[PDB]
Amino acid sequence: VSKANVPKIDVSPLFGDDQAAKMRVAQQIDAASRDTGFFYAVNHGINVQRLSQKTKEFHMSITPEEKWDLAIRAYNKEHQDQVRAGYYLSIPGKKAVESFCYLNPNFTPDHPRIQAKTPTHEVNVWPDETKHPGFQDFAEQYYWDVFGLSSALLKGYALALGKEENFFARHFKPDDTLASVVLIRYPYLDPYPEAAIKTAADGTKLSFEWHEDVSLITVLYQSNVQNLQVETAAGYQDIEADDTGYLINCGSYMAHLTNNYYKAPIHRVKWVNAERQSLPFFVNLGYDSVIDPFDPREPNGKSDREPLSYGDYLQNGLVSLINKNGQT
Ligand SMILES: CSC[C@@H](NC(=O)[C@H](CS)NC(=O)CCC[C@H]([NH3+])C(=O)O)C(=O)O
Ligand SMILES: [Fe+3]
């Protein structure tokens, strides 16, 4: 398989006030978005080594009892309110992956959307503080660090599409974003059960099948173990690993809003027998956020798509992804 073109882009100007330098970053985002759909954000300012260390400490110390106590409803019928947030268990002999998902720390018991029991909004669940000292505080702070990077990236995408820098960012707010962090553990297993390995039509062994992301953009940290592939006009291509940067791509809400000018790249996860991490941040807007679809390839910029609220998009997309590629 040939190597995919995934450029490294220094996104540091997006945190500053040099408008010309921001346009030069926006062009790089435009170019990558129009080519393979992927780029590595470098000079992003986040301490990813500490994120990996704290995540490993958690994954390797959590016990079976704690996983049931934090489990989503797909694994524990007693937790009917946990559709998104909580622990997603492995099934030894059958399913290797396991993970922990958390949402906006501002979704507290008194938040208006939590009081209304609005779909896709939940109060996070956390392990015992005595058993995992500092974990909740670290994880909540990580949400806000990656939120800050994501806001800066959204400024770059807006400028790239010919809009004002707050075009997307104005709908991405601390008090109501539906964004999520997922701490995914992909384990080393000896023997690796065949039931946990899928095979693509082209013969490639996979851990997760082809898909488009359910997001506006996805901001991903991964270990230094090659595993991702992107479908291009030249076929599936390997994405090189880089554990110092963030791998960025568009999700299907960006494809909808831009009329496929910036596509949501189809990508898949190869099977690798290695202990590693996949830590995505899905950049989701607010429940009622609606951006009128447009088309940057058309002179009048008009699109033939109907407006879709982010809440409707997200609820439907997450269900569809489970139906297509299985409960994770
Ligand atoms: C390289 S794909 C990256 C990663 N796979 C995932 O993260 C998959 C596909 S993006 N996403 C999902 O299952 C949606 C989770 C949504 C979350 N539960 C929520 O409530 O927000 C991986 O396997 O490495
Ligand atoms: Fe994905």
UniProtKB/Swiss-Prot annotation:
Q: What's its EC? A: 1.21.3.1
Record-listed isopenicillin N binding positions: R84, Y88, S180, Y186, S278
Record's cofactor remark: Binds 1 Fe(2+) ion per subunit.
Result of altering P280 to A/I/V: Strongly reduced the catalytic activity
Per the UniProt entry, the effect of L220 to I/V is:
Strongly reduced the catalytic activity
- List required co-factors: Fe(2+)
Query: Which positions bind Fe(2+)?
Result: H211, D213, H267
Q: What are the binding positions for 2-oxoglutarate in this chain? A: R276
What's an example Gene Ontology biological process for this entry? penicillin biosynthetic process
Where in the cell? Cytoplasm, Cytosol
The protein's site described by Transition state stabilizer is found at F208
Q: Give the main localization category.
A: cytoplasm
Q: Which GO terms describe its molecular function?
A: iron ion binding; isopenicillin-N synthase activity; L-ascorbic acid binding
Q: Which InterPro entries match?
A: DIOX_N (IPR026992), IPNS-like_FE2OG_OXY (IPR044861), IPNS-like_sf (IPR027443), Isopenicillin-N_synth_CS (IPR002057), Oxoglu/Fe-dep_dioxygenase_dom (IPR005123)
Q: In which pathway does it act?
A: Antibiotic biosynthesis; penicillin G biosynthesis; penicillin G from L-alpha-aminoadipate and L-cysteine and L-valine: step 2/3
Q: Per UniProt, what does mutating V269T do?
A: Strongly reduced the catalytic activity
Which amino acid positions bind N-[(5S)-5-amino-5-carboxypentanoyl]-L-cysteinyl-D-valine, per UniProt?
R84, Y88, S180, Y186, H211, D213, S278
Would you tell me the Gene Ontology cellular component terms? cytosol
Fe2OG dioxygenase domain residues are: 173-285
Q: What EC class does the entry list?
A: oxidoreductase
Q: Which domain of life is it from?
A: Eukaryota
Record's subunit section: Monomer.
What family is this? Belongs to the iron/ascorbate-dependent oxidoreductase family.
Task: Describe its function.
Answer: Isopenicillin N synthase; part of the gene cluster that mediates the biosynthesis of penicillin, the world's most important antibiotic. IpnA catalyzes the cyclization of the tripeptide N-[(5S)-5-amino-5-carboxypentanoyl]-L-cysteinyl-D-valine (LLD-ACV or ACV) to form isopenicillin N (IPN) that contains the beta-lactam nucleus. The penicillin biosynthesis occurs via 3 enzymatic steps, the first corresponding to the production of the tripeptide N-[(5S)-5-amino-5-carboxypentanoyl]-L-cysteinyl-D-valine (LLD-ACV or ACV) by the NRPS acvA.
Which PANTHER family does UniProt cross-reference here?
2-OXOGLUTARATE (2OG) AND FE(II)-DEPENDENT OXYGENASE SUPERFAMILY PROTEIN (PTHR10209:SF867), OXIDOREDUCTASE, 2OG-FE II OXYGENASE FAMILY PROTEIN (PTHR10209)
Under what name is this protein listed? Isopenicillin N synthase
